[PDB]
């Protein structure tokens, strides 16, 4: 029945007219493709080259960590050099963008304050102005954690440390909580021009509290200086260096795993209970020896 | 060794019937006058088995629910479910999402199999119930004679070889060898097919025991007279029992629709494994480990499976079946609805099927003229002119001389279908007079019967004499009926228009050739005569008895003839007309006598006028019958006598070279052989039947059809469809309905099959170009089982695109349900435009949200990574997991909505295969509703609160809804011009490549 | 702020739509 492979004269199944149909499908599928690209082209006419057409999805930016772990977890032996190597290299390449000889140009780089400062507004989001300068970030701002060449350098080898970073959003201008700050634990008085961040063991119940935490920020404030905002997008600001802030855990119980959460506070900031990375942060660390 | 058993059952029977009664009883060890001894009787009764058929060997338990759960389509969904379950099992290789995905899916497939199973099951069950309600078996106790004494015992207690007496009305308890009889006419109507009651006698008549008069048969009622007989056969060993067991023992065969679906499945799974394998290879050719490649393989295959279309087909069929039932046409089985549509040959039975199996007045002789009466069950015909006085005289003769009287409870009943106690002919005549001339009650009691002579054993004249009811002349009225030649012997005067005459050979032979013409017409003729009496010679007080000649039995006044036959059912002739019109070949298969069979055949239009049999030619031309070349004969009446000596090639030839065929005098086994013979030709056969002789035939046919009332029980059990109202015209509607539901199935199928392109492609190019997954599993389900359901059903309500009863029956080999063309449309063309629409919407959403399409490539690796929370879009922004995943889910919803949008267009063009939508039009209301409910539904799932929590389906921004729009319009405009070109050029390249 | 979308209102529209769209469907199948 299906032994119709080839005979006089049809190629399996029927091979008289194969040209016609194939030609047809070539024309047809050609046209379809054309039409598709057509619609995708006009669609592409309607997106702004500067700002994305919808930002409502990234609205509460998230807090991220230097050594993004398999699942939020740094577990390592203080001794074995290969124990922490993955993390160490992650940090190494992360801050490789931040070195002082990497921001050489005064054409595209700008030296901002040594102290947190008011937001730097550059024009509008069009191209009338040139490509915007980008504010410098010197690794010295985080002391004892990547420390330039000066210490750690085990980068926590004795006791654990993680840099937290804020997610980039084009146009986003962080508003820190008012000087009427509804109980934000222990923090400096530099609320005017800094987006604050603080770390805790468990969220809002009992905790296996074991931690002493030291923070390194711009000028010493545990947060993000407003001067680096707003972000102008990859087109208007390539080589844009965003603020980094480091958190070192000095006192911790070594052979036990305890969980840490870092919250960033502000009105412009928000948290989702479904997204544990939205506005907040989670890290499980166990340093075992 | 049951093969052999059935091999002896397909062979026509034998008997001992021709024996000297001396030798008969010598063999059976019995006394002919005294029967046998009670001890002996109970000795045999418990020696074998009581007189009754072993109950139908079939009693499938409700465990037969299981049947509905498999077949072949539910098999496809089963292996699908299993594959998904295996896939998730393999996804137990890790910590894995399918808690909402693969197990969800496999369980859903299972749910569809089980639910569709339950539905179809419930339907067939319901039909079985309504059939059970028809079962009424009354015990009828047989009359035996044992030790010389007549004893009436339960019929099941009758043994082999004891004397039995049967009387007027008695049913024949078991197979008898008549030893003695008086005026005994048994009704063989359902068993052998003989229309008129056959008389039974001691004497051996025909070599074939079925036609002989010295045997009486189980399940046949004795119409009249009385007879004695020795029981030759008891229980299952009887004739009707052998038939019944053959019938129980036959095979259904695969229904045509079921086969078409099998082939359909072969196509679907074909593309399924081609895609699955080719992409398995392709996936390995890139990166993904065998694990991932296998998951993709199971993925693509399972995705190719239409879960919805099992429901939408079952519902489709059920709808058509519902209409069938509304018309009092019941289908035992669910797929049995289509079969008529595929039928190229109808083998029909004669008595009780094509005819009413009720002796009825056909033609009458008045004033040397033939007037046809109305032979229809419903009286839908033409009444004769009853004004003439000759008819009045005649009608009084027929009404007055009879033993026929209506029974106690027949008043409200229609005069025809109402019961009557009397002879065959007497019943016909009684009903006829009670109909045409008014009532026979006051009419028969008007004239008072003095002395009557019942039918004599010889000469069969029946006379009676009454007093005068008129006011003018008070002479005694004499009346007599009898066979035309005998009454012609005793008649002199003839009446015309109310005044007398003697007989002249001109009109005497006019009567002779009228009698030979009506007799030749297949009808049975009766001479009707009357004579007034010379009341001067026979005074008002004269009491004449039946001793000497009181009345001048000669020189009487011959009035006329009344002829009668069992007529076709009113609806029949037109119906056979339509079936022939639709190109179905009608073959009559009857066990009746050829002389009547041919006449009824010509009457219902199975043999058209002017078509000559071999013998008609031989007769007209005055030559030996052997001379004529059979090619010159279009029609043939095949005697069963020859049918026994016939071979395969011979019967094949008869069926091949004759257009109008009647097999007469054919045993049930031979009916089976004829059906099988039409099936050797590779054609779809439908059988229509009444009695037990159609049991093996109706079973073997691709579709059997019983008669709900005039049908017997065994053949009703054998039938795949029953006619409750006993209307033959239903057959026609049947072939129309099934012919239509074929087309609509295509449409439905096509529609659903179009959705597998825009459904499968997302997971395809997900693996290929490494973009984030455009369309999820839940969305895909909302399409397959959620939205498309109502439209895909609504398609079943589509109407005839042209006159279907015009077109020839389909060819099972050539014309297919799902064929290479359909797939070339659904997968090849329309499905593709759909897919493109979908992806377009996808890119509009992602590009608007900040991921430009070109940047979406390769992204998935990091995109699907739960722990990368800085993910660069085209604007340099950083997305977490849940954020971008919410855009992916809010990218699944618009892909789903887009599918709906393009299924609008698809549903409107799938409505019509050939006609442009501007012709056939939107008159389908369910379809409109389908569109509304569909869109409403999609809108709901997008926008209902917490659906992003439940289904990961998010509200669409309004502009989204329109991305799909031009693609739908393209689909519509495209197919419309295809269905324009096809109309304009029916050569045709578009018609050959596309029209499906 | 461009970081706010009236989803509740589009949500309301689509639903109110789904409501009419359905009951107009029902009028249609019930032609009396
Ligand atoms: C069935 C056919 C149904 C009607 C088809 C027409 C139809 O759907 O029109 C659209 C309207 C929706 O109104 P609008 O959304 O345009 O109102 C403006 C705005 N959303 C507001 O409320 O401030 O939708 C409805 O609510 C509905
Ligand atoms: C890149 C890829 O993505 C993830 O899984 C991928 C494979 C597998 O997991 C699933 C879910 O189980 C598959 C599944 O097999 C088959 C489907 C059920 C199939 C359908 C049949 C049907 O009828 O409807 C749809 C088509 C795609 C499908 O809908 C899903 C899509 C989600 C996905 O999750 C994708 C993992 O992260 C994986 O490790 C990584 O290789
Ligand atoms: C949005 C979709 C638009 C893109 C598709 C464009 C269609 C282009 C198809 C390419 C042509 C393929 O070849 C078909 C013709 O082959 C030879 C036959 O020629 C005449 C056919 O013309 C169209 C078909 O109409 C019916 C044909 O009837 C005339 C008999 O033709 C010969 C058939 O052999
Ligand atoms: C054909 C009509 C197409 C017109 C159109 O899209 O309409 C603009 C529309 O959409 C709004 O404008 C936006 C502009 O970015 C769109 O992106 C939408 O997501 C939405 O915020 O506003 C109307 C009220 O709902 C209209 O029905 C439609 O919903
Ligand atoms: C555009 C999408 C469909 C357009 C359409 O289908 O138009 C035809 C409609 O017109 C109908 O009535 C008939 C169909 O018999 O259509 C012609 C009207 O001029 C005429 O031939 C006839 O009166 C009914 O409204 C609809 O059901 C039918 O679709
Ligand atoms: C950074 O690390 C240095 C060690 O190299 C710390 O220096 C010590 O500081 C403590 C007071 O906290 C003194 O008692 C020690 O004598 C110091 N030792 C050395 C070698 O400097 C320094 O405190 C760390 N700074 C922070 C902010 O953690
Ligand atoms: C000639 C006619 C019939 C239609 C041809 C198609 C082109 C010219 C038009 C018609 C439909 C249109 C699209 C439908 C609506 C979407 C959604 C919106 O968010 C951006 C614009 C966008 C992407 C449109 C771009 C241009 C489009 C593809
Ligand atoms: C037959 C053809 C013309 C189909 C036309 C139906 C279109 C125009 C209908 C069907 C579904 C409808 C949408 C469903 C969702 C709502 C959300 C609401 O907040 C604003 C309008 C909006 C977005 C509707 C606009 C009109 C809509 C897209
Ligand atoms: C907040 O209040 C403190 C005194 O409680 C004051 O010293 C400080 O300057 C205030 N800062 C702002 C921003 O108002
Ligand atoms: C750190 O913890 C140890 C033991 O838990 C304690 O003795 C020590 O004082 C702590 N260091 C501080 C408080 O600086
Ligand atoms: Mg059958
Ligand atoms: Mg019959
Ligand atoms: Mg599908």
Whether B531 contacts B551, CB under 8 Å: yes
Ligand nearest to the CA of B961: 8
B424, burial (CB in 10 Å: exposed 0-12, middle 13-18, buried 19+): buried
Decide if B835 is inside a domain: yes
With a CB cutoff of 8 Å and minimum separation 6, the contacts of B65 are: B117, B118, B121
- Best mutation site among A51, A53, A55 for testing chain C: the one with the most C CBs within 10 Å? A55
What count of other Cβ atoms lies within 10 Å of the Cβ of residue B787? 25
Q: CA nearest B550: which of B476, B644, B485? A: B476
Atom of ligand 2 nearest to the CA of B777: 29
Same-domain check for residues B294 and B326: yes
d(CA B439, CA B376): 19
Interchain contact, A171 vs C2, CB within 8 Å = yes
Handedness of CA B339, B340, B342, B343 (dihedral sign): positive
Q: Is B16 annotated as a binding residue?
A: no
Handedness of CA A16, A19, A25, A28 (dihedral sign): negative
Same-domain check for residues B10 and B78: no
d(CA B111, CA B102): 14
Tokens of A48: 């702004």
Decide if B61 is inside a domain: no
Handedness of CA B570, B573, B578, B583 (dihedral sign): positive
Same-domain check for residues A269 and A253: yes
Whether A191 contacts A177, CB under 8 Å: yes
3-state secondary structure at position B539:
coil
Atom of ligand 6 nearest to the CA of A248: 28
Same-domain check for residues A27 and A62: no
Q: CA nearest A58: which of B475, B887, B336, B232? A: B887
Tokens of B597: 């069979």
CA distances for B668 relative to B240, B648, B704, angstroms: 10, 18, 14
d(CA B120, CA B311): 10
The closest residue, in CA terms, to atom 5 on ligand 9 is A179
Angle at B185 between CA B181 and CA B191, to 5 degrees: 120
d(CA B231, CA B36): 11
Pairing of strands B499-501, B491-496: antiparallel
What count of other Cβ atoms lies within 10 Å of the Cβ of residue B558? 24
Q: What is the DSSP letter of B591?
A: S
Same-domain check for residues A26 and A166: no
B598, burial (CB in 10 Å: exposed 0-12, middle 13-18, buried 19+): buried
Q: Which residues line ligand 9 (CB under 6 A)?
A: A 179, 189, 191-192
The closest residue, in CA terms, to atom 22 on ligand 5 is B919
Site to substitute for ligand 1 among C11, C17, C21, C24, most atoms within 8 A of C-beta: C17
d(CA A98, CA B70): 67
Bond from prior residue into A168 cis (ω within 30 degrees of 0): no
Specify the CATH number for the domain of residue B425. 3.40.1110.10
Query: How many Å is the Cα radius of gyration of chain C?
Result: 15
Same-domain check for residues A137 and A191: yes
The residues with which B491 forms a beta bridge, in sequence order, are: B556
Query: Which H or E run contains B108?
Result: helix B102-132
Pairing of strands B198-199, B462-466: unpaired
Q: Helix B594-604 to helix B572-581 angle, to the nearest 10 degrees?
A: 70
Q: Is B460 annotated as a binding residue?
A: yes
C16 in contact with chain B, both atoms CB, cutoff 8 A: no
State residue A37 phi and psi, 5-degree precision. Answer: -60, -35
- For residue A278, give how far its alpha carbon lies from the nearest alpha carbon of chain B (Å): 7
Q: CA nearest B654: which of B593, B581, B670, B690? A: B670
Question: Does ligand 2 come within 6 angstroms of the Cβ of B425?
Answer: no
d(CA B944, CA B967): 26
Same-domain check for residues B75 and B174: no
3-state secondary structure at position B229:
strand
d(CA B755, CA B604): 50
Same-domain check for residues B328 and B352: no
Query: Which H or E run contains B370?
Result: strand B370-372
d(CA B662, CA B597): 7
CA distances for B787 relative to A262, B930, C28, angstroms: 45, 8, 18
d(CA B750, CA B756): 10
Task: Please give, one letter per residue, the 3-state secondary structure of B776-820.
Answer: CHHHHHHHHHHHCHHHHHHHHHCCCCCCCCCCCCCCCCCCCCCCH
Query: How many Å is the Cα radius of gyration of chain B?
Result: 38
Query: Strand runs (DSSP E) across B534-576, as ranges?
Result: 556-565
Bond from prior residue into A13 cis (ω within 30 degrees of 0): yes
State residue A189 phi and psi, 5-degree precision. Answer: -100, 20
CA distances for B645 relative to A133, B639, B641, B651, angstroms: 109, 11, 8, 10
What count of other Cβ atoms lies within 10 Å of the Cβ of residue A12? 11
CA of B781 to the centre of ligand 13 (A): 8
Same-domain check for residues B783 and B794: yes
Q: How far apart are the first and last CA of chain B?
A: 47
Q: Helix B925-943 to helix B892-910 angle, to the nearest 10 degrees?
A: 180
d(CA B381, CA B299): 67
With a CB cutoff of 8 Å and minimum separation 6, the contacts of A207 are: A200, A201
d(CA B893, CA B887): 10
Tokens of B140: 């009828």
- Nearest chain B Cα to C19, which residue? B936
The number of distinct structural domains making up chain B is 4
Angle at B446 between CA B441 and CA B448, to 5 degrees: 110
3-state secondary structure at position B454:
coil
The residue among A28, A47, A66 that closes a domain is: A47
Whether B584 contacts B343, CB under 8 Å: yes
d(CA A147, CA B106): 56
Q: What is the DSSP letter of B921?
A: -
The residue among B544, B567, B590 that closes a domain is: B567
Pairing of strands B449-453, B142-146: unpaired
Q: What is the DSSP letter of B158?
A: -
The residues with which B330 forms a beta bridge, in sequence order, are: B722
What count of other Cβ atoms lies within 10 Å of the Cβ of residue B294? 17
**Dihedral of the alpha carbons of B605, B608, B613, B615, in degrees to the nearest 10:** 80
Same-domain check for residues A149 and A22: no
Q: CA nearest B157: which of B170, B167, B146? A: B146
Q: Which residues line ligand 5 (CB under 6 A)?
A: B 917-918, 921-923
Question: Does ligand 3 come within 6 angstroms of the Cβ of B812?
Answer: no
Same-domain check for residues A287 and A154: yes
What count of other Cβ atoms lies within 10 Å of the Cβ of residue B497? 10
Specify the CATH number for the domain of residue A29. 1.20.5.170
Tokens of B713: 């029980």
Same-domain check for residues A39 and A96: no
CA of B2 to the centre of ligand 11 (A): 20
The residue among A47, A68, A84 that closes a domain is: A47
Phi-psi region of B335 (alpha: psi -120 to 50; beta: other; left: phi over 0): alpha
Whether B422 contacts B402, CB under 8 Å: yes
Whether B113 contacts B81, CB under 8 Å: yes
C21 in contact with chain B, both atoms CB, cutoff 8 A: yes
Query: Which H or E run contains C20?
Result: helix C7-29
Pairing of strands B685-688, B345-348: parallel
| CA A117 centroid distance within chain | 22
Question: Does ligand 8 come within 6 angstroms of the Cβ of C13?
Answer: yes
B888 in contact with chain A, both atoms CB, cutoff 8 A: no
The residues with which B231 forms a beta bridge, in sequence order, are: B176
d(CA B268, CA B753): 9
Looking only at Cα atoms, what is the longest distance across chain C?
A: 53
Q: CA nearest B996: which of B821, B810, B804? A: B821
Interchain contact, B935 vs C5, CB within 8 Å = no
Question: Does ligand 4 come within 6 angstroms of the Cβ of B959?
Answer: yes
Q: CA nearest B169: which of B218, B94, B224, B129? A: B224
Closest in C7, C18, C31 to B936, CB measured: C18
Same-domain check for residues B838 and B867: yes
| Burial profile B763-778: b = 16 or more Cβ within 10 angstroms, e = fewer | bbebbeebbbbbbbbb
DSSP B57-96: S----GGGHHHHTTTTHHHHHHHHHHHHHHHHHHGGGSS-
Same-domain check for residues B504 and B410: yes
Query: Which H or E run contains B927?
Result: helix B925-943
Task: Please give, one letter per residue, the 3-state secondary structure of B828-868.
Answer: HHHHHHHHHHHHHHHHHHHHHCCCCHHHHCCCHHHHCCCCC
Its domain, for residue A100, covers 48-289
Site to substitute for ligand 10 among A159, A212, A248, A251, most atoms within 8 A of C-beta: A251
- Best mutation site among C4, C9, C19, C22 for testing chain B: the one with the most B CBs within 10 Å? C22
Tokens of B467: 């007093």
Whether B909 contacts B867, CB under 8 Å: no
Whether B85 contacts B103, CB under 8 Å: yes
Specify the CATH number for the domain of residue B286. 1.20.1110.10
- For residue C17, give how far its alpha carbon lies from the nearest alpha carbon of chain B (Å): 7
The residue among A47, A66, A84 that closes a domain is: A47
Interchain contact, C21 vs B936, CB within 8 Å = yes
d(CA B113, CA B76): 9
Ligand nearest to the CA of B944: 8
Atom of ligand 3 nearest to the CA of B981: 25
Alpha helical stretches, state H, B552-624 = 572-581, 594-604, 614-620
Query: Strand runs (DSSP E) across B491-533, as ranges?
Result: 491-496, 499-501, 524-532
User: Tokens 């634990």 appear where?
Assistant: A185
Residues of B with catalytic roles:
349
d(CA A183, CA A195): 15
Q: How many CA atoms lie within 13 A of B57 on its CB side?
A: 10
Same-domain check for residues A77 and A208: yes
Whether B891 contacts B884, CB under 8 Å: no
Whether B348 contacts B589, CB under 8 Å: yes
Bond from prior residue into B988 cis (ω within 30 degrees of 0): yes
d(CA B196, CA B223): 10
The residue among B547, B567, B587 that closes a domain is: B567
Its domain, for residue B869, covers 67-120+250-343+729-996
Bond from prior residue into B185 cis (ω within 30 degrees of 0): no
Angle at A73 between CA A67 and CA A76, to 5 degrees: 85
What count of other Cβ atoms lies within 10 Å of the Cβ of residue B969? 14
Decide if B62 is inside a domain: no
Chain C hits for B958, CB-CB cut-off 8 Å, are: 10, 13
Question: Does ligand 4 come within 6 angstroms of the Cβ of B55?
Answer: no
Decide if B125 is inside a domain: no
Task: Please give, one letter per residue, the 3-state secondary structure of B667-693.
Answer: CHHHHHHHHHHHHHCCCCEEEECCCHH
d(CA B345, CA B579): 9
3-state secondary structure at position A273:
coil
Q: What is the DSSP letter of B826?
A: I
DSSP B395-443: HHHHHHS-S-EE-TT-SSS-TTTS-EES-HHHHHHHHHHHHHSS-SHHH
**How many residue pairs bridge chain B and chain C with CB atoms within 8 Å of each other?**
56
| Burial profile B194-222: b = 16 or more Cβ within 10 angstroms, e = fewer | bbbbbbbbeeebeebbbbbbbbbbbbbbb
Q: CA nearest B798: which of B932, B928, B912, B907? A: B912
d(CA B963, CA A39): 9
Handedness of CA B877, B881, B883, B888 (dihedral sign): positive
The residues with which B558 forms a beta bridge, in sequence order, are: B494, B529
- Best mutation site among A125, A270, A275 for testing chain B: the one with the most B CBs within 10 Å? A275
User: Tokens 């013979």 appear where?
Assistant: B677
Pairing of strands A134-135, A109-110: parallel
d(CA B668, CA B700): 12
The residue among B231, B249, B267 that closes a domain is: B249
Tokens of A61: 């930016």
- For residue A180, give how far its alpha carbon lies from the nearest alpha carbon of chain B (Å): 30
Whether B861 contacts A58, CB under 8 Å: no
**Dihedral of the alpha carbons of B431, B433, B435, B437, in degrees to the nearest 10:** -170
Q: CA nearest B763: which of B321, B211, B319, B296? A: B296
Same-domain check for residues A96 and A181: yes
d(CA A84, CA A70): 14
Same-domain check for residues A30 and A146: no
The number of distinct structural domains making up chain A is 2
Same-domain check for residues B255 and B210: no
- Nearest chain B Cα to A65, which residue? B869
Whether B714 contacts B245, CB under 8 Å: no
Whether A169 contacts A63, CB under 8 Å: no
Bond from prior residue into A153 cis (ω within 30 degrees of 0): yes
Angle at B917 between CA B911 and CA B923, to 5 degrees: 70
Closest in C21, C25, C26 to B939, CB measured: C21
The residues with which A65 forms a beta bridge, in sequence order, are: A164
Decide if B60 is inside a domain: no
CA of B894 to the centre of ligand 8 (A): 13
Tokens of A251: 């006192």
Tokens of A256: 């036990």
Whether B15 contacts B131, CB under 8 Å: no
State residue B583 phi and psi, 5-degree precision. Answer: 85, 10
Same-domain check for residues B502 and B624: no
Atom of ligand 5 nearest to the CA of B924: 27
d(CA B326, CA B952): 45
Same-domain check for residues B137 and B108: no
Specify the CATH number for the domain of residue B615. 3.40.50.1000
State residue B416 phi and psi, 5-degree precision. Answer: -80, -60
| CA B284 centroid distance within chain | 55
Same-domain check for residues B533 and B413: yes
State residue A220 phi and psi, 5-degree precision. Answer: 110, 5
Same-domain check for residues B81 and B153: no
Whether B592 contacts B197, CB under 8 Å: no
Same-domain check for residues A148 and A23: no
Whether B738 contacts B342, CB under 8 Å: yes
CA distances for B292 relative to B92, B278, B623, B954, angstroms: 13, 15, 86, 29
3-state secondary structure at position A64:
strand
Q: How many CA atoms lie within 13 A of B429 on its CB side?
A: 27
Decide if B619 is inside a domain: yes
Interchain contact, C17 vs B939, CB within 8 Å = yes
Same-domain check for residues A9 and A72: no
């Amino acid at each position: 029945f299906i032994w119709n492979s080839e005979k006089k004269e049809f190629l399996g199944r029927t091979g008289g007219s194969w040209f016609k149909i194939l030609l047809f499908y070539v024309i047809f599928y050609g046209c379809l493709a054309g039409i598709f690209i057509g619609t995708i082209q006009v669609m592409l006419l309607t997106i702004s080259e500067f700002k994305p057409t919808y930002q409502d999805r990234v609205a509460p930016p998230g807090l991220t960590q230097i050594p993004q772990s398999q699942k939020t977890e740094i577990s390592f032996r203080p001794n074995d050099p290969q124990s922490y190597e993955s993390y160490v290299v992650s940090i190494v390449r992360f801050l490789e963008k931040y070195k002082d000889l990497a921001q050489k140009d005064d054409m595209i780089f700008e030296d901002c304050g040594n102290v947190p400062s008011e937001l730097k507004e550059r024009g509008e989001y069009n191209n009338e102005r040139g490509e915007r300068k980008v504010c410098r970030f010197r690794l010295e701002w985080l002391g004892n954690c990547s420390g330039l060449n000066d210490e750690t350098y085990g980068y926590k080898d004795g006791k654990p440390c993680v840099i937290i970073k804020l997610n980039r959003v084009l146009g986003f201008k962080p508003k820190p909580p008012k000087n009427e700050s509804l109980e934000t634990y222990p923090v400096m008085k530099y609320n005017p021009y800094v987006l604050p961040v603080h770390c805790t063991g468990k969220r809002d119940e009992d905790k296996e509290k074991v931690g002493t935490m030291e923070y390194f920020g711009l000028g010493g404030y545990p947060g993000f200086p407003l001067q680096y905002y707003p972000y102008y997008g990859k087109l208007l600001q390539p080589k844009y260096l965003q603020p980094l802030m480091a958190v070192q855990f000095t006192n911790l119980t070594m052979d036990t795993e305890i969980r840490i959460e870092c919250k960033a506070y502000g009105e412009n900031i928000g948290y989702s209970e479904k997204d544990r990375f939205q506005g907040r942060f989670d890290v499980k660390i166990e340093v075992k020896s | 060794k049951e093969r052999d058993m059935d091999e002896l059952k397909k062979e026509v029977s034998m008997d001992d019937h021709k024996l000297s009664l001396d030798e008969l009883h010598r063999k059976y060890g019995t006394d002919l006058s005294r029967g046998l001894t009670p001890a002996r009787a109970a000795e045999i009764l418990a020696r074998d088995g009581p007189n009754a058929l072993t109950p139908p060997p079939t009693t499938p338990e409700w465990v037969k629910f299981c049947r509905q759960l498999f077949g072949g389509f539910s098999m496809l969904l089963w292996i699908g479910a299993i594959l998904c379950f295996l896939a998730y099992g393999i996804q137990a290789a890790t910590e894995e999402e399918p808690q909402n995905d693969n197990l969800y899916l496999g369980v859903v497939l299972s749910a569809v199999v089980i639910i569709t199973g339950c539905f179809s099951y419930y339907q067939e069950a319901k039909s079985s119930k309504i059939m059970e309600s028809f079962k009424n078996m009354v015990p009828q106790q047989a009359l035996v004679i044992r030790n010389g004494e007549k004893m009436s015992i339960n019929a099941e207690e009758v043994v082999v070889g004891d004397l039995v007496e049967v009387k007027g009305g008695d049913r024949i308890p078991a197979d008898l060898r008549i030893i003695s009889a008086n005026g005994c006419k048994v009704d063989n109507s359902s068993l052998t097919g003989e229309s008129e009651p056959q008389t039974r006698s001691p004497d051996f008549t025909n070599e074939n025991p079925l036609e002989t008069r010295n045997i009486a048969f189980f399940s046949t009622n004795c119409v009249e007279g009385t007879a004695r007989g020795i029981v030759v056969y008891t229980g299952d060993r009887t004739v009707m029992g052998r038939i019944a067991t053959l019938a129980s023992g036959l095979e259904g065969g695969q229904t045509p629709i079921a086969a078409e679906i099998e082939h359909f499945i072969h196509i679907i799974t074909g593309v399924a494994v081609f895609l699955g394998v080719s992409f398995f290879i392709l996936s390995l050719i890139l990166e993904y480990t065998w694990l991932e490649a296998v998951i993709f393989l199971i993925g693509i295959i399972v995705a190719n499976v239409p879960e919805g279309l099992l429901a939408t087909v079952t519902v489709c069929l059920t709808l058509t079946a519902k209409r069938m039932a509304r018309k009092n046409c019941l289908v035992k089985n669910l797929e049995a609805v289509e079969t008529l549509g595929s039928t190229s040959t109808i083998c029909s039975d004669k008595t009780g099927t094509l005819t009413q199996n009720r002796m009825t007045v056909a033609h009458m002789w008045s004033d040397n003229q033939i007037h046809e009466a109305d032979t229809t069950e419903n009286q839908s015909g033409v009444s004769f002119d009853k004004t003439s006085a000759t008819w009045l005289a005649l009608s009084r003769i027929a009404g007055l001389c009879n033993r026929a009287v209506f029974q106690a409870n027949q008043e409200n009943l229609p005069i025809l279908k109402r019961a009557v106690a009397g002879d065959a002919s007497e019943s016909a005549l009684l009903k006829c007079i009670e109909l045409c001339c008014g009532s026979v009650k006051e009419m028969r009691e008007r004239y008072t019967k003095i002395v009557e002579i019942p039918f004599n054993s010889t000469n069969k004249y029946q006379l009676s004499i009454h007093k005068n009811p008129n006011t003018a002349e008070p002479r005694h009225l004499l009346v007599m009926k009898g066979a035309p030649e005998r009454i012609l012997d005793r008649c002199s005067s003839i009446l015309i228009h109310g005044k007398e005459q003697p007989l002249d050979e001109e009109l005497k032979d006019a009567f002779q050739n009228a009698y030979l013409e009506l007799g030749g017409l297949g009808e049975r003729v009766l001479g009707f005569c009357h004579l007034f009496l010379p009341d001067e010679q026979f005074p008002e007080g004269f009491q004449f008895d039946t001793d000497d000649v009181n009345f001048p039995l000669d020189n009487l006044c011959f009035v006329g003839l009344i002829s009668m036959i069992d007529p076709p059912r009113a609806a029949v002739p037109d119906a056979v007309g339509k079936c022939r019109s639709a190109g179905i070949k009608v073959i009559m298969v009857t066990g009746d006598h050829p002389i009547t069979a041919k006449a009824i055949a010509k009457g219902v239009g199975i043999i058209s006028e002017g078509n000559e049999t071999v013998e008609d030619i031989a007769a007209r031309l005055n030559i030996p019958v052997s001379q004529v070349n059979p090619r010159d004969a279009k029609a043939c009446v095949v005697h069963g006598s020859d049918l026994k000596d016939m071979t395969s090639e011979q019967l094949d030839d008869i069926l091949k070279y004759h257009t109008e065929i009647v097999f007469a005098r054919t045993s049930p086994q031979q009916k089976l052989i004829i059906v099988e013979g039409c099936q050797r030709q590779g054609a779809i056969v439908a059988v229509t039947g009444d009695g037990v002789n159609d049991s093996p035939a109706s079973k073997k046919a691709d579709i059997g059809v019983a008669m709900g009332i005039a049908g017997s029980d065994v053949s009703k059990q054998a039938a795949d469809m029953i006619l409750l109202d006993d209307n033959f015209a239903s057959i026609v509607t049947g072939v129309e309905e099934g012919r239509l539901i074929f087309d609509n199935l295509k449409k439905s199928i096509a529609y659903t099959l179009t959705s597998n392109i825009p459904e499968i492609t997302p997971f395809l190019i997900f693996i290929i170009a490494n973009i984030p997954l455009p369309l999820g599993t839940v969305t895909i389900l909302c399409i397959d089982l959620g939205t498309d359901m109502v439209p895909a059903i609504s398609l079943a309500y589509e109407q005839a695109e042209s006159d279907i009863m015009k077109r020839q029956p389909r060819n099972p080999k050539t014309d297919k349900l799902v064929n290479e063309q359909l797939i070339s449309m659904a997968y090849g063309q329309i499905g593709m435009i759909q897919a493109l629409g979908g992806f377009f919407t996808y890119f509009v959403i992602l590009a608007e949200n900040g991921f430009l399409p070109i940047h979406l490539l390769g992204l998935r690796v990091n995109w699907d990574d739960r722990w990368i929370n800085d993910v660069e879009d085209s604007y340099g922004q950083q997305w977490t997991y849940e954020q971008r995943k919410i855009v992916e889910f809010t990218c699944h919803t618009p892909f789903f909505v887009t599918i709906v949008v393009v299924q609008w267009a698809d549903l409107v063009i799938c409505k019509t295969r050939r006609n442009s939508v501007f012709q056939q039009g939107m008159k389908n209301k369910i379809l409109i509703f389908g569109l509304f409910e569909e869109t409403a539904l999609a809108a709901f799932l997008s926008y209902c609160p917490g659906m992003g929590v439940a289904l990961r389906m998010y509200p669409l921004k309004p502009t989204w809804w329109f991305c799909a729009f031009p693609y739908s319009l393209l689909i519509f405009v495209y197919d419309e011009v295809r269905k324009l070109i096809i109309r304009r050029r029916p050569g045709g390249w578009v018609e050959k490549e596309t029209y499906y | 702020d461009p970081f706010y979308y009236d989803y509740e209102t589009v949500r309301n529209g689509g639903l109110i739509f789904a409501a009419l769209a359905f009951i107009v469907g029902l009028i249609i199948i019930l032609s009396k």
